[PDB]
Symmetry: C2
Subunit: 124 residues, 2 copies
Amino acid sequence: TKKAVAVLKGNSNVEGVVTLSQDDDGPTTVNVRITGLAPGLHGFHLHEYGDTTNGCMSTGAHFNPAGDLGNIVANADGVAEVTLVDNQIPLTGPNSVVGRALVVHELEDAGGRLACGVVGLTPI
Amino acid sequence: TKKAVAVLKGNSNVEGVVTLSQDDDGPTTVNVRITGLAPGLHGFHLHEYGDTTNGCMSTGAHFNPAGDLGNIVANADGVAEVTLVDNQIPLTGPNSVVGRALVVHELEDGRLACGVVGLTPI
Ligand SMILES: [Cu+2]
Ligand SMILES: [Cu+2]
């Protein structure tokens, strides 16, 4: 019933697409495909602000109304392809993440900020 | 009381920053600074989708629940610096433009640049 997207870019080689989907006030399906990563674990987080004026730094802190989405795993080719299901990522209501940022880190679970993107509406 | 931002980029040299500000359900102050424009008039619009996966084209059509914000004027240096006040740009409600796109055009009234409308601190 509701879809969002985030195009990930940053001060590095790391780039990707994340799609989020949600039926009503239910759980949220997150499709992560991110390339150019150092093989291994990487912190994947929801930051508070869709602000990209000072790179990934203007996105602020973790979105806690936490916004830690876990680690994602980059294979030997530096590709992290995974599907998450989280319950704390509303696309609706007071706590909508629409208009905030997704950030991928250099380290696991925080690390430097390789790439981010604003969470924008995509068609259903 | 509420602030948003859009960083504009695209398949060209055109880039910029737009900040929007709103008190309650009032009128919305839009600060446009965009560089690298062809001197003259340029269409400045609100598109439906914060989707940048296919450059500015995935942002879709005008945001009509129109989303025409007018023309902006680029000087001899290709800089369009202006402050608009529009009433049809809510940062709140069913019609929030938070998560959509701002798009600047090659003509007045192609897509030179765009940016998703994200939350900035107040
Ligand atoms: Cu983070
Ligand atoms: Cu347009």
